[PDB]
């Protein structure tokens, strides 16, 4: 994908994570689990709504009969409404497969820029703190319990108070 | 001396979805929400919160002329589009043309106010001439010679028709809905049986309308066992507005006319399928769609609020993200 | 330590646009699509002012209509303007037959020649050209009747065969509009023609029509029973049209030499007339714009953006604004 | 947004910033100041300058009276008409209220990839030698004065002319 | 050291493409999506040739004006084809009825066959069918007139009532031609008709007309004062169709069995016809392409492109081109 | 640009690598050459086939006569005609003009995408056994054969194998 997460960097999904379209998976001494990321998942079904809606809600139209009827010497006429009828067959029906094709190509990489930036958001907060070891996934230098785990979930994880430690193990 | 470990990740699920993308056929997705309507229930419904008119066996020609077979049928006061089937034939059961018929059918498609009334009482409006014996097998009702409901075939009384004249002045507060024919008899001598004058003419004329009819005596290819023709006029006389009729033979007079309200813009549906008590904002031929979706593939020919007309057998719009289960 | 930072731009700026994922982003720097300005006015189209017909119709002015002659009409015209309220128009009843065919022919004109092709005094010296006035089309209080036009009438208690031919010397296009007059009675019939079974007969190289008086009473209008049909031609540079008639012909007095152009149409609006130029028209007031789109008015003449429904079509240019 | 940086990682703009979209705060001891990265602004004024007009410019209509007369018996040919403006009317306001939001969208992710490009091709050049302290902001670990500060925006930052210095900062200020 | 370098291709292409943010970009590949080329061919659509009228125009082909007799009819043909300069159509002057839907109904047919509706030598025991012809159609100089209509004309000194009907069988649509003769004086109409005073009735279940001839001296057409009048009906299988006339009447001698297929169309060009087949034909040339658009002509015939004022629609497929 | 490979921080493309559109050049010991990455070509070339395809055949027009006549009587049908057909000639020729420009942006952003993603796999697997030097090149901190270098294409490149090594290099 656009942006080299989802079927990229990251192999797989998981199933086991129901509560939300993106977050965690954590391994520490007193357990482990998944968890959806809820803000960014909630942000991106804010977003996804709203694009469904826009496709949606833009199309307003009036009270209108389509239908017209001529006898056999209004031939042309009839031709012609035909012509009208047609022409706005050819063009809604070319616009509505290309902006479906054209936009769940964007929807993918939507999503797919969702997942890299919340992998981003926890590399920049961990820094040297832990290893990338692939496949989406930090191991820590550190112990890095419930509380430190959900540190690094809100973006609120202390890189100086584990950073002896880490640096320790790290050399 | 593993260390603990952080995962990101994203959500899989076992839906089967697939989407289209401009890249990629068949992609399936986490979730999905369908832009095409393909769904109708199958009913001709009610428009605006009102019914349509049902004609029955009889075209729009029938109904509004009054065909005897037409009699059963009933008329509310207002309707939203009006449905004949396709095996509606009941139509001019006497030969002839219907001047301007598409006109009026689209002109009667929805009505807000619908009143038929006696312009022309049959009992009072005719003493020097026969409003009896306008009858033809051609318009049989019950196996006995009949005629048009809304119409009067007059013909000669004793061996006089004399000059006709007649005048409607609209008092209705609302267009006047006036319909007549000229008969064209298949000989002279047919010509003289029915109305003794040879040489006739009808005039009708109000503030707007205005024209002279001269009867084309022939004999035409036999229709309905008819070699003669009729033709069918008809005109909105303006409130305030007077209609008037002349005539030395040869005229069909109205006896019945419609005060009306003409209500916007409807159209005609042609079809079998029946009627519900249902509410719809958006009907086609063969259903009604309820939908808020801007795309359908049930039928290009609607009437209503309605998606618009596609090709596509498929819109498929991801919302979610491709799916990867384990 | 010393420090470097990336960055963006925030400014004042309070312009909101809508984008698929989210409404209301507020952005630095945007434009806006639609047009939904005029100004109020009538404007000279291809720098070539509307003709404005005041409280007279296209009928009423062709035909002559007493009350329209006032009106100043130009050799040439961008388009037509009719107010909703202009209904001075045939004063004799009748019908204006391919009436709509012939506003739209009139539309624009790049040139426009009124001639009397039949002079009064000497074109009909057989006939009254004199009686034909009706209090159904007043000139200050007096009968009178179209300017264009002359209800011939019998001279004495003689109507003789008429024949008038006319060769279209113009260079151009001339229109040719004349009546036929359908009595409301045998008597009105004989007081006016002194015939009693009378035709017209109108001829050129394309066109051909006999017509035949229809008498009877119709319902009053403008205190007429009878009835007055009003015909239109265009006779080719070079062409003959031909008149022959045994009673019954507003004949015509003037005639019209033009060259069409295009294709415009007809305004009906109150809006007022302007010395300004537009490309884009539209009934409630010019457009000037290179946007292509406009809620203003679906109905529009010249080289203008497409109508749209909505009330805000604003493209972001700059990015999100986030002040602080 | 979708690259990340601007309500991203950098949370806000710079009022400060009046002479273009993208650039640059410095600070050091001969003081501070915003500066405009003059290129990605202009390319990125060009490139939205050419999607504006593109916009505007690709539709080129020809002169048309849109308006037609029918008189009371052409109800049909009028309601023709009528589908015919309606359906323009519709397939117009369709697509141009789609377009809005579509282009949109993608002029906020462009100026985001602006941002963030810039961002990574100052990361590239300081590497080691500052430190990347969130907020889209760099801290030296190294004296930088203003010929420093202005080689870095002109992407001809010299790494191993400060790297020394920064070698040990970093080890101390690490312990 | 050792190295490793990511890259992308660069060629010599020289094709350009338009993006949103950038004009004229060089790119390694791109396709067009824009038809901007025709084979200045009037070719066969569906397979079928179309009928090539030649320096006639429909009306004169389909009424028989006498230089329309060496074109050659097909019994089938998917269009029309007339040129800017066939002008040979009703050589006597006067009013087509209904001619643009004629040509609308004739443009594509699947079937078509001439045959003699009412035969010269036996329809008209009481009438002259010899003498209507005239200079206004002349064939090799002499007079003569349309193939497919008789101007019959009063035998001695009588033209006494005339009724004539024909009833089809022909199992298809039978699309009957004929004309109502006006003439300049009652001389003349006398000296052609002898009666003065006629009409003519024409009838089916469907039709029914009658027509009153108008006398007047008209401006010269082909130096003719008097003037006719064209009509034409379509009649249903099983259905008759009567004529009846007391003078005045131009009646068929030839009609067309016909079968008329889908929404075809006439073409007006110079372009020579060819043996080629197409699925896309303008007036100018035939359009072989699966693009989605084209600006060769707004008038096409076919399953074509969409139109187009397009000089110019580079897909790239390839990448910004730097070498 | 919207990737900051392509003419971004790799400058100019490789008129020496012929057989596709992205891949690699290397120098080691046993040699030096261009080689095109064939995957990431093919998945280029078959999603922008796709896509062409996709624009193309979206549109199934119906068997049509575009043209009408009119006699000198219909100048207001002739003119509701010249309408339509105008009508369609703009919603056309605006939407396929604006189809091509905001595609070609796309198809542009795409090949970026590509070139970037092939980037950022070699950067991650690399590591610090090499270094970043720039556009869009590794210095490898140790000796990296055929097989090395391949290992290094598919994915699979062994840092454990090369990092005393590498280490010894780099200090
Ligand atoms: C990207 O490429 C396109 C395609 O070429 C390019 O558009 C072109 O711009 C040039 C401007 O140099 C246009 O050329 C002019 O077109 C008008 C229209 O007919 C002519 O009248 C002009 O002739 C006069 O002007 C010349 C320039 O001053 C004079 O030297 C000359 O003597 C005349 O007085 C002139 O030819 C050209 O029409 C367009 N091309 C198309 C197909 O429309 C665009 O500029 C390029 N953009 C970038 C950023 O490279
Ligand atoms: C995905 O898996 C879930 C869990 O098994 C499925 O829901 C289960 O459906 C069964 C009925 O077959 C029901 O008895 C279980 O209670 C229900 N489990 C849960 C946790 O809801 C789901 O399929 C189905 O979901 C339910 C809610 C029902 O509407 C059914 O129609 C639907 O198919 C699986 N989804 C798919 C697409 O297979
Ligand atoms: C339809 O709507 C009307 C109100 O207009 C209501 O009275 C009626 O009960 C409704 N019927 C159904 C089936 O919804
Ligand atoms: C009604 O229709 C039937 C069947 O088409 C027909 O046989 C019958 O004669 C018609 N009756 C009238 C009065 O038109
Ligand atoms: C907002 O700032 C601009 C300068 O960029 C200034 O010119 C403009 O007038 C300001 N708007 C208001 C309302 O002060
Ligand atoms: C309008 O334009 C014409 C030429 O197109 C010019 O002669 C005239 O002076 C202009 N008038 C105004 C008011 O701009
Ligand atoms: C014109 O003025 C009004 C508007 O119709 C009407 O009352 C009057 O009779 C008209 N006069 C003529 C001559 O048309
Ligand atoms: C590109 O190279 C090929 C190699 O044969 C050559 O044929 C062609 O002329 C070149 N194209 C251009 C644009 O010069
Ligand atoms: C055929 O056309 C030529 C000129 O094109 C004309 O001179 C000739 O009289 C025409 N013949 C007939 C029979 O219409
Ligand atoms: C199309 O034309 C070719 C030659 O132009 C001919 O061989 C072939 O029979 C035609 N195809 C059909 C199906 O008529």
Redesign the interface.
């Given at each position: 994908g656009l942006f080299g997460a989802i079927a990229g960097f990251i192999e797989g999904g998981w199933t086991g994570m129901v509560d939300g379209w993106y977050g965690y998976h954590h391994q520490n001494e007193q357990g482990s689990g998944y968890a959806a990321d809820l803000k960014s998942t909630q942000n991106a079904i804010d977003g996804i709504t709203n694009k469904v809606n826009s496709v949606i809600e833009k199309m307003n139209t009036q009270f209108t009969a389509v239908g017209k009827e001529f006898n056999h010497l209004e031939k042309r006429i009839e031709n012609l409404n035909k012509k009208v009828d047609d022409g706005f067959l050819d063009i809604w029906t070319y616009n509505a497969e290309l902006l479906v094709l054209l936009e769940n190509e964007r929807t993918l990489d939507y999503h797919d820029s969702n997942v890299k930036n919340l992998y981003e958001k926890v590399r920049s907060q961990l820094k040297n703190n832990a290893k990338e070891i692939g496949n989406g996934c930090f191991e820590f230098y550190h112990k890095c319990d419930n509380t430190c785990m959900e540190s690094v979930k809100n973006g609120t994880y202390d890189y100086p108070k584990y950073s002896e430690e880490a640096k320790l193990n790290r050399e | 001396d593993?260390?603990?470990?952080?995962?990101?990740?994203?959500?899989?699920?076992?839906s089967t979805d697939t989407?289209?993308?401009?890249?990629?056929?068949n992609?399936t997705?986490?979730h999905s929400?369908n832009?095409?309507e393909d769904k109708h229930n199958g009913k001709l419904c009610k428009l605006?919160g009102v019914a349509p008119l049902h004609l029955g066996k009889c075209n729009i020609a029938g109904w509004i002329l009054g065909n005897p077979e037409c009699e059963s049928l009933s008329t509310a006061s207002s309707w939203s589009?009006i449905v004949e089937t396709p095996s509606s034939d009941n139509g001019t059961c006497y030969?002839?043309?219907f001047i301007?018929?598409?006109?009026l059918?689209?002109?009667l498609?929805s009505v807000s106010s619908f009143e038929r009334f006696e312009i022309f009482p049959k009992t009072s409006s005719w003493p020097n001439h026969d409003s009896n014996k306008g009858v033809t097998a051609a318009c049989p009702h019950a196996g006995a010679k009949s005629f048009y409901k809304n119409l009067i075939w007059l013909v000669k009384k004793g061996n006089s028709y004399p000059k006709l004249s007649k005048?409607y002045i609209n008092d209705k507060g609302k267009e006047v809905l006036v319909l007549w024919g000229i008969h064209?008899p298949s000989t002279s001598a047919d010509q003289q049986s029915l109305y003794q004058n040879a040489d006739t003419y009808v005039?009708v004329?109000?503030?707007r309308y205005?024209?002279?009819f001269k009867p084309?005596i022939?004999?035409?290819?036999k229709?309905r066992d008819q070699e003669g023709?009729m033709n069918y006029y008809w005109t909105?006389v303006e409130p305030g507005?007077?209609?008037?009729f002349?005539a030395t033979g040869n005229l069909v007079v109205p006896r019945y006319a419609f005060a009306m309200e003409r209500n916007?813009?409807?159209?005609?549906?042609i079809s079998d399928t029946p009627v519900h008590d249902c509410n719809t904002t958006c009907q086609t031929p063969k259903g009604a769609i309820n939908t808020?979706?801007?795309?359908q593939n049930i039928h290009?020919?609607?009437?209503?609020?309605?998606?618009?007309?596609?090709?596509?057998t498929k819109?498929?719009?991801?919302?979610?993200?491709?799916?990867?289960?384990?």
């Open positions: - | 593993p260390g603990d470990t952080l995962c990101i990740g994203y959500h899989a699920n076992n989407v289209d993308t401009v890249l990629e056929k992609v997705v986490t929400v832009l095409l605006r589009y030969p002839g043309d301007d018929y598409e006109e059918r689209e002109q498609s005048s064209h005039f004329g109000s503030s205005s024209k002279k084309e022939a004999i035409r290819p229709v023709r909105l507005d007077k209609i008037t002349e916007a813009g409807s159209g005609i549906i808020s979706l801007p795309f290009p020919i609607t009437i209503g609020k309605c998606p618009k007309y596609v090709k596509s819109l498929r719009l991801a919302t979610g993200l491709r799916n990867i289960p384990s």
